[PDB]
Amino acid sequence: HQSIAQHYHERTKYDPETIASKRLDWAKQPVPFKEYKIGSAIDLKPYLQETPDTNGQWWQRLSRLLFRSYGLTARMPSMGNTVYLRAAPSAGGLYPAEVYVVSRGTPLLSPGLYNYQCRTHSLIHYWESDVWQSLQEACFWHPALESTQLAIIVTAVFYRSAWRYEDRAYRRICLDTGHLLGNIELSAAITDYRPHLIGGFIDEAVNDLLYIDPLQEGAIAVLPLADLLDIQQNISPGCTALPSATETNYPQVPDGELLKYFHHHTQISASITGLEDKYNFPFCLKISTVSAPIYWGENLSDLEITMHKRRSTRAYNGEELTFDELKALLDFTYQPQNYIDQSLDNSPDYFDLNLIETFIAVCGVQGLEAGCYYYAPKAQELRQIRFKNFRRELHFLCLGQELGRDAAAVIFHTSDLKSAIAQYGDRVYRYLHMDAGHLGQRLNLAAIQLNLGVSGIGGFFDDQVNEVLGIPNDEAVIYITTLGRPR
Numbered sequence: 001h002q003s004i005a006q007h008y009h010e011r012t013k014y015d016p017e018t019i020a021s022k023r024l025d026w027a028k029q030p031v032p033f034k035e036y037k038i039g040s041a042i043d044l045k046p047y048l049q050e051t052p053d054t055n056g057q058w059w060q061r062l063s064r065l066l067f068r069s070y071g072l073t074a075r076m077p078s079m080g081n082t083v084y085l086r087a088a089p090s091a092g093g094l095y096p097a098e099v100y101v102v103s104r105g106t107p108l109l110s111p112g113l114y115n116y117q118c119r120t121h122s123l124i125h126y127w128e129s130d131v132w133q134s135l136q137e138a139c140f141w142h143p144a145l146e147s148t149q150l151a152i153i154v155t156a157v158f159y160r161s162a163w164r165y166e167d168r169a170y171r172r173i174c175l176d177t178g179h180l181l182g183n184i185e186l187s188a189a190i191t192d193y194r195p196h197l198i199g200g201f202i203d204e205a206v207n208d209l210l211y212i213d214p215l216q217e218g219a220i221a222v223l224p225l226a227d228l229l230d231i232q233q234n235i236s237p238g239c240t241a242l243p244s245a246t247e248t249n250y251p252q253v254p255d256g257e258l259l260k261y262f263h264h265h266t267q268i269s270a271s272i273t274g275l276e277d278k279y280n281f282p283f284c285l286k287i288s289t290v291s292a293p294i295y296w297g298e299n300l301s302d303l304e305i306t307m308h309k310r311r312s313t314r315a316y317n318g319e320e321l322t323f324d325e326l327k328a329l330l331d332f333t334y335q336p337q338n339y340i341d342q343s344l345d346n347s348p349d350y351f352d353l354n355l356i357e358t359f360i361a362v363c364g365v366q367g368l369e370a371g372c373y374y375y376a377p378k379a380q381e382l383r384q385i386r387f388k389n390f391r392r393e394l395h396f397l398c399l400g401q402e403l404g405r406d407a408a409a410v411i412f413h414t415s416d417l418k419s420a421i422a423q424y425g426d427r428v429y430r431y432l433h434m435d436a437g438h439l440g441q442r443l444n445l446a447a448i449q450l451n452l453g454v455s456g457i458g459g460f461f462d463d464q465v466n467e468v469l470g471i472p473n474d475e476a477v478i479y480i481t482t483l484g485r486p487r
């Protein structure tokens, strides 16, 4: 019998037979920022600067870490108003993620709870008390909390995405959040911090600790921030993910009620007690993807510029990528060990990349036949599984978007959901989508650094993808990332 994550997935697919048979409540379009009536505001803008104090140097690092992670980087006009685009992309420009900072209490940062205000690049200190032990208990005394003095917690304000995507919003929320997680690790590197990803925590406890309404908002990632300038905080990566239960006895949940049901049925509760790529394709054509690394400038200066200017490309011109360009994108995304000499982490935390497979539809990469390839990141190989021009198909698969038709290459992240659930329970659904978004952000940043076009695609004809591209039946497509040359 299917578990609730499989049911959720099935219920949120798009089907060409029914997509036409499926009105936004504008009176209700959410404002994607939180308001606080009580608390001290800490303005971070004075520290987002140039040159020419050790306390100021500390605030500059926190200010920059937050700004490069989730700061406002552009504005658009929209129905008589302005949408502010951010460092992290978001399905529909809806921004379900909220960033909090939790302080253990240091001589510079009072203890308690802080909300990151994108609009003003400030922190609102809305609760001053020592909350660290409560956070430790909620995360099963994770060792990363013992060494550190502050943590980011990322939550999702469900309605921000559900307003548009209804129950399908849970996929988009987790993807959006994964993109933000990718910025956090890169932004941290820039500022000599390392985040320690904690996906395994007692939801009830974390949500209580933040004083948020769990029907409207819920924590999905806890990230202690280790200060790499403190020898004592250069700690080993730890357990990034824990299992939830597997629920097979779910009731019939009406449309519109499934997203919250699913979030509340993927929680973790207090305890009662206490190296080969997956698909060998041995008789298929294999092509090495070994690449020289992307150069990010002195002291990651070009990574900073790229993070600031990064936008999702509206349209492609249909021109080709070079194979070197494709290899460089894959290298930065999947081979972080090749960036240690540029001060990036050789192994940034994910929940579990072993659960995610990568397939690439290639339509316009010079030196590569058009078709579908399995990407084997451990071996650093593309293995050709189909030989065909897939432009027309990809156009359809991406819900009719020209981005799919005109892309040079389209990267599909997939997962065998049954197997994933067997390991981490239904909560693995969160982990998969956050990991795919994290990979996605690395791909987006690499593309922009290389003067290429890129855009995620959240909605697609789920079942039809495998059929067209030759992706093994057991692999459910989780996310799509298009790559091309900008129009």
Ligand SMILES: Cc1cc2nc3c(=O)[nH]c(=O)nc-3n(C[C@H](O)[C@H](O)[C@H](O)COP(=O)(O)O)c2cc1C
Binding pocket: 085, 086, 087, 088, 089, 090, 091, 092, 093, 172, 175, 176, 179, 310, 311, 312, 313, 401, 403, 455, 456, 457, 458, 459
């Ligand atoms: C999970 C996710 C799904 C997305 N789906 C699409 C999509 O199908 N089509 C599209 O044109 N852009 C898509 N995007 C891009 C968003 O529209 C974009 O991130 C948002 O408008 C903000 O713009 P920015 O990325 O330039 O900051 C997606 C982005 C995310 C992160």
Ligand SMILES: [Ca+2]
Binding pocket: 312, 313, 314, 455
């Ligand atoms: Ca777009």
Ligand SMILES: [Cl-]
Binding pocket: 126, 127, 128, 129
């Ligand atoms: Cl207080």
Ligand SMILES: [Cl-]
Binding pocket: 280, 281, 282, 283, 284
């Ligand atoms: Cl084979």
